[PDB]
Amino acid sequence: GLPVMNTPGSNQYLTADNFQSPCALPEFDVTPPIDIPGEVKNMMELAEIDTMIPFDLSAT
Amino acid sequence: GLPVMNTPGSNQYLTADNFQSPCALPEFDVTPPIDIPGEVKNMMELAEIDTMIPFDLSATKKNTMEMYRVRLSDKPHTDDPILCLSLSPASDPRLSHTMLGEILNYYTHWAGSLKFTFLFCGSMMATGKLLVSYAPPGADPPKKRKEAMLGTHVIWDIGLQSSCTMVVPWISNTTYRQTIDDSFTEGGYISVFYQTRIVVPLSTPREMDILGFVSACNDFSVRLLRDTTHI
Amino acid sequence: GLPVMNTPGSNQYLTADNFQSPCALPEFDVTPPIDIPGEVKNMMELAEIDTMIPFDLSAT
Amino acid sequence: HRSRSESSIESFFARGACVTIMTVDNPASTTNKDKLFAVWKITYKDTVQLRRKLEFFTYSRFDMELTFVVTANFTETNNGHALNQVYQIMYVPPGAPVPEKWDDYTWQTSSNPSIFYTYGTAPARISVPYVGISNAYSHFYDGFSLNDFGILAVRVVNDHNPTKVTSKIRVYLKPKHIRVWCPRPPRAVAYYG
Amino acid sequence: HRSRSESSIESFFARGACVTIMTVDNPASTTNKDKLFAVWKITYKDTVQLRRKLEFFTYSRFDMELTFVVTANFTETNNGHALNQVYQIMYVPPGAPVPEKWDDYTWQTSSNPSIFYTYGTAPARISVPYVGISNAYSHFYDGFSLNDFGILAVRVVNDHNPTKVTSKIRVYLKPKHIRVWCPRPPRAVAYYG
Amino acid sequence: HRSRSESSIESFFARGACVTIMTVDNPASTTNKDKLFAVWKITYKDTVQLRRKLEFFTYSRFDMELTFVVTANFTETNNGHALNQVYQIMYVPPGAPVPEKWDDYTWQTSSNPSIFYTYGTAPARISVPYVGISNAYSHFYDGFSLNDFGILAVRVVNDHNPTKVTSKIRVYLKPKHIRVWCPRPPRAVAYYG
Amino acid sequence: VLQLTLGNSTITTQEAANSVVAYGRWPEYLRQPTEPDVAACRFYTLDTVSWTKESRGWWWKLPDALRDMGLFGQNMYYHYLGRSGYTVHVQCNASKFHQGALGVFAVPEMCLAGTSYQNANPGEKGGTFTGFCPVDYLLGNGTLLGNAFVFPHQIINLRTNNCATLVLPYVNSLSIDSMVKHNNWGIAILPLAPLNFASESSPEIPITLTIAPMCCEFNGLR
Incomplete structure (x- = not known):
């Protein structure tokens, strides 16, 4: 068939990698989502919130 | 040639996988199909069929003809219902064995409505009234006719209409319901009471029989197949 | 390179298979054909010929 | 009817x-008996799950995507070494003669x-196609003289x-492109063993 | 806000x-006990990093791209040889029955x-999709009779x-296509062991 | 004539x-004889199935897609280990000189x-093309001074x-792009052994 | 009162309202054989059966029922191949004081079980279930009978309608087939609700089958 040449970095599982994997439930129809209020899109949204500095961190 | 990089998930046989496999008979010319009548395209078509609820599953009546008939005599007229059928369609042993229940034993989740049908198989002369109640989820079933009447019900005059349909509706918090719940009876309670004791004319047998049928409605659907058949 | 995923049915020799194999004589210039009379295109052509039924198949 | 697909005949x-x-x-x-080769007529009538599913219906057509999972092991502790073996997995189509010896003529045919x-x-x-003489596999046939795969x-x-x-x-049959006809009351799990 | 992406929920x-x-x-x-097979209910509630990250938020949806890294070794010095083994990695979906013996019916199902x-x-x-009965995985649920993956x-x-x-x-879960809802004070690393 | 293809000359x-x-x-x-190498003149005249099929017809052209299935085994129980071998499968074209020793000049040619x-x-x-001097392989030739593949x-x-x-x-010859000419009475299976 | 006719036969139907076509497909000729629609397509009324209280059921195979039945039975012996749809009128004429119900189930490939030809083929008299004789609530094969209502079927509930009609198309894996060997269809009549009646009324009501072979066509005549 189409002649290919297996490069280095083959058969390695790089945990960072992003690929198209084969789904174990191919026929399963997923429960759709809904508009739950309070969706977060970025962690920094949680840092743009005025939380409360603890000043006195003495043992007591 | 073209440089490729074998990813993970290679040389694995995932039984779920869908690929183009090499045919062992490449030249063979398949016998064409024909228009056989009765083609099925979906298993739910077999659940939209009104099969027959077995009510009496006692050791004697069960696994005979008698397990489908509910007997209506004119004996001491007690308020406890003729029958009360819980709609846990796969969990309730009665509805478990219907074709609905058969297909639902092949699936983890289901949703939709169920039409029940009660058929009076008594004398053409017999007259009376049966009250067909439906208690909704959570509600403990009615014990007396009044309690049932105050809820949802249908008074069914045997004389006039010889059958009685009732489409129990879809109600669930989730989008679906498990078929093996947490051993928790919920949802349906299709009860049938006497409103009036049955009237018969001359020497007509006071013991009649009624049959009960059940079918998934059009909206009904299942998901997440679960084969469990084994030996 | 191009990430590929070796499926099952790989490195199997299915005798029925049809693929593009690498020619051992890549430069060789084949002797061309000619119009020999009597080309067969299908075995059934040989069954559309009136051969001769043997009726008496006795030992003699 | 929320995407009834999962109960479609293909999905089923x-x-x-x-x-x-x-x-x-x-x-x-050494003393190896006629276990040198194995033979098995393709038939759903032994596996109960697929049998029970097919016997919902009277007739059917389906391709057949068999998959083979071979796993070996040394018999005795005299392991030592042994070179990577090769297995001939022959699919004898219907009506053809089945092997009888390890090296019968059929293996080279x-x-x-x-x-x-x-x-x-x-x-x-491999993917066996529909190999029926009929226009559909009959699971129940009221008649006189079962189908061959x-x-x-x-x-x-x-x-x-x-x-x-x-x-x-391990042979992993996955029926593919199924069509079925004439539903039936499903046989009970009780009478298969 | 220089390309805040790295702290996006997906990247996180x-x-x-x-x-x-x-x-x-x-x-x-020889004497092999019921260690012949291993079973594990998919749950983040044992790994602390992923748990602590998810429990920032109240609800979530996510596909799940499990990856399996198998590594073997001879037990005793009687190594000698042994042929390349094959492993059946079965993903029992939610609500299905879990295996109990090495050769239970479930393995062939x-x-x-x-x-x-x-x-x-x-x-x-494999890539398990979202297998929730709800429209979102609940990490905290004030209610009466935890979710199944x-x-x-x-x-x-x-x-x-x-x-x-x-x-x-080694199972390497990588949640994929995550969406989350209703942020919360993060639980402290202190109370997980 | 329902799709007569299966009996087309290619399919046949x-x-x-x-x-x-x-x-x-x-x-x-140790004592290895001249079995160190094997030689075989490509010829259908030994296999009966292909011979009998070709001898339906008088002349033919066909490419030839040879396939090689190599399988090894340790001779004695002194197995121990041995590294993965490599095999030189040389296709000596027609009219060329055939090897005589293990390391004849021909192997490097x-x-x-x-x-x-x-x-x-x-x-x-490999895929040997049509290597005929004639414009067709002659299976029967009434004449004086057999063809070379x-x-x-x-x-x-x-x-x-x-x-x-x-x-x-095992050499698995699959004749490809066959054309044939001048049908003949098929020889009987009787006289081939 | 609809009076139906087919050549030298005539039938008195109540009216063809509660008429079930099996699998929604009307009998059709093949879209090659001869079509003896001349006189073989008529009403063959079998010998009536008596439904007592104790009855468990009855069954016929098709076309094994119509094997000794005149021209159809002739055609179906002297030809090698044939195919035929049917119209089965099950009339069950009882008074207003009898009560009960009958499930009439047309069954494709109704392989019964308690095995041999004469045993699996009762002809015109039909066979009967029993609580050989197959099990009534199984139809021989170990089925729960309620599930039987997947089959093309009709109820005859004596209070209401007293007759059913089943229009059966030709169901088979093949386009045409030998009728002498292989029975495509199978009719089973089981009493869902048992018969009962007023004190000194007729203690056994009759049931009558009328079978019109529709769109029959045969090949090749010996």
Whole structure:
């Protein structure tokens, strides 16, 4: 068939990698989502919130 | 040639996988199909069929003809219902064995409505009234006719209409319901009471029989197949 | 390179298979054909010929 | 009717299902019996899940994507070493003659397609098409003189082996492109064993 | 706000993370106990990094790209040789029955998808989709009668093995397509052990 | 005439068919005879199925997609270990000189194409084209002074091996692009052995 | 009162309202054989059966029922191949004081079980279930009878309608087939609700089958 040449970095599982994997439930129809209020899109949204500095961190 | 990089998930046989496999008979010319009548395209078509609820599953009546008939005599007229059928369609042993229940034993989740049908198989002369109640989820079933009447019900005059349909509706918090719940009876309670004791004319047998049928409605659907058949 | 995923049915020799194999004589210039009379295109052509039924198949 | 697909006939039937475990041996010259090769007529009537599912319906057509999972092991502790074996997985189509010896004429026959699976590689696979003489497989036939899908024969190709090596081949039939006709009351799980 | 992406919810959660080490044994006929197969209900509530990250938020949806890293070793110094093993990695979906014996009916069942991973090849991988009955996984639920993602069962398919071969399977869950809802004060690292 | 294709000349002839089993040995320095290499003149006149099919017709042209299935085994129980061997499968075209020794000049010759098949990989394969001097292979020739397709020679490339390793190479000739001419009464199966 | 006719036969139907076509497919000729629609397509009324209280059921195979039945039975012996749809009128004429119900189930490939030809083929008299004789609530094969209502079927509930009609198309794996060997269809009549009646009324009501072979066509005549 189409002649290919297996490069280095083959058969390695790089945990960072992003690929198209084969789904174990191919026929399963997923429960759709809904508009739950309070969706977060970025962690920094949680840092743009005025939380409360603890000043006195003495043992007591 | 073209440089490729074998990813993970290679040389694995995932039984779920869908690929183009090499045919062992490449030249063979398949016998064409024909228009056989009765083609099925979906298993739910077999659940939209009104099969027959077995009510009496006692050791004697069960696994005979008698397990489908509910007997209506004119004996001491007690308020406890003729029958009360819980709609846990796969969990309730009665509805478990219907074709609905058969297909639902092949699936983890289901949703939709169920039409029940009660058929009076008594004398053409017999007259009376049966009250067909439906208690909704959570509600403990009615014990007396009044309690049932105050809820949802249908008074069914045997004389006039010889059958009685009732489409129990879809109600669930989730989008679906498990078929093996947490051993928790919920949802349906299709009860049938006497409103009036049955009237018969001359020497007509006071013991009649009624049959009960059940079918998934059009909206009904299942998901997440679960084969469990084994030996 | 191009990430590929070796499926099952790989490195199997299915005798029925049809693929593009690498020619051992890549430069060789084949002797061309000619119009020999009597080309067969299908075995059934040989069954559309009136051969001769043997009726008496006795030992003699 | 929220996307009733999952109960479509394809979704219902088309699932990988082990239909048999075929055991073969290495042609060791010690005392190896006629276990040198295994033979199995393709039939759903032994596996209960697929049988019970098909017997919902009266007639059917389906291609058949068999998959083979071979796994070997040294018999005795005299392991030492042994070179990677190759297995001939012959699919004898319907009406054809089935093997009888390890090296019958049938194994070399052009007709019978055959896989040569090397151990320790990706599982082998063929796709038998619909091989019915009828226009549909009959699961119930009220009549007088069962349908044929073929035979699978399996052997080890290697010959002069010093150590015995047992090997089981799991066949994973996945019916593909199923169509079915004339639903029926499903038989009970009770009467299959 | 220089390309805040790196703190996006996808970038935050979607990372390969070992959630369990499942140990199985070879079916040697010597004294092998019920370690012949391993079972593990998919759950983040044991791994602290992923747990703590998810419990920033109240609800979530996410696909799940499990990856399996199998590594074996001879138990005793009676190594000698042993043929390349194959592992059945069955993903029992939610609400389905979990295996109990090495050769329970569940392993052959059509429903349960299964990988057949040959040793010494590329790591196996499936992608479980969102298998929630709800429209979102609830990490905190003030209510009365936890969510199900499934079970992973693992066994060695080979049978008559003379030498014992232990094998650990690292599961590398990488949640994919995450969406989350209703942020919360993060629980402290203190109370997880 | 419902799709007469299956009896077309291509469908009829173009089938994988084992034409020979060539046995070679490892160059062990013990007492190995001239079995170190195997030689076989490509000829259908030994296999009966293909012969009988071709001898329906008088003349023919066809490419030739040979496929090689190599399978080895340790000779004695002194197995121990032995590294993965490599096989030189040389296709000596017509009219060229055939090898005589293990390391004749012919094996290094540029002309003769050669495969270097490593054991335990996918089966090797070449496609010999039509190598006829005539414009068609003559199966019957009433005349005076048989046709040449070539020779296949096979050896193990490895040299200093301590353990003997026999190996059989199955050649699977599949004639491709066949054309035939002048049908004939088919010879009887009776007179071929 | 609809009076139906087919050549030298005539039938008195109440009216063809509660008429079930099996699988929604009307009998059709093949879209090659001869079509003896001349006189073989008529009403063959079998010998009536008596439904007592104790009855468990009855069954006929098709076309094995119509094997000794005149021209159809002739055609179906002297030809090698044939195919035929049917119209089965099950009339069950009882008074207003009898009560009960009958499930009339047309069954494709109705392989019964308690095996031999004469045993699996009762002809015109039909066979009967029993609590050989197959099990009534199984139809021989170990089925729960409620599930039977997947089959093309009709109820005859004596209070309401006293007759059913089943229009059966030709169901088979093949386009045409030998009728002498292989019975495509199978009719089973089981009493869902048992018969009962007023004190000194007729203690056994009759049931009558009328079978019109529709769109029959045969090949090749010996």
